[model samples]
Target: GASRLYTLVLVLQPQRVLLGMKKRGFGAGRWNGFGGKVQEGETIEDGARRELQEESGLTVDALHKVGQIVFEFVGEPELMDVHVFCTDSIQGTPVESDEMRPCWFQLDQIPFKDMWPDDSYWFPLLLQKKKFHGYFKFQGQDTILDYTLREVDTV
Candidate 1:
């Protein structure tokens, strides 16, 4: 399998960040940021924005790239290159879509227990407004076999 590129956006407003409960597909049942694979002919930013609108019905007014993470699953040959973005403003109300149900949580009350196992390690960096790059090797979706993360000078 070939490595694939994707984007993830954490929509933020003051002390709150938006997360989506995936309704179908790979990450279903987890509370995670809005994101999907990058599409052909689309910039990573554009694909991130498009996925946000498609999943949560919010049109991001501004987005900033803050991090990147390369995820690998043991025994799987493909890698997921995820670009992380954050936005403080958006247009339209967030409504449940075919892909996810949107929810807002205070920065202090993020539902880490219901999100991807690796998120807790890096989300703090995002909240603290830092740039980062990381890699995680997983034995399964719920088990991180090993990881290496750092605050990078640039995302």
Candidate 2:
């Protein structure tokens, strides 16, 4: 099956990272980076930037691509090709939207249990500022059937 392109953007500070609590739809109730499907005619980076503003009301000057992951669910035929980006420079305050509520979490206190199971595997690499690639197969939303993750010099 062909994979669908998506993006996830993380806003980072020295000791904290900004995440959004998904309010509805696909990843509702989970704490995650702000992003969604890439729209036609828009570049992936543009999609990432647009989603951040739409979901969290923040705009960034630049985005560093840190990771990419392919996600597969048990009964789904399509895969999600998610591009993950991070930026330490940003503008505007985060505001709640119909899709997400933004919050800042300490690096050591991220709520892994409330995030996607695959997050724990790649999130540390992200925090360390390493580029990575991963593949995750899920039995359901909460359980990983199998997966592979590797750190790379480029993503």
Which candidate tops lDDT?
A: 2
Which candidate ranks first by TM-score, i.e. highest? 2
> What residue pairs are clashing in model 1?
none
Global lDDT of each candidate:
0.92, 0.92
After superposition on all CA atoms, how large is the RMSD of candidate 1?
1.2
Per residue, candidate 1 scores C-alpha lDDT tens digits across 1-155 of 57899999998889799899999988789998999999999999999999999998889778999999999998888899999999988899899999899998999998989999999999999999999998999987899988989998878
lDDT of 2 by residue, 3-24 (tens): 9999999998899999988988
TM-score of 1: 0.96
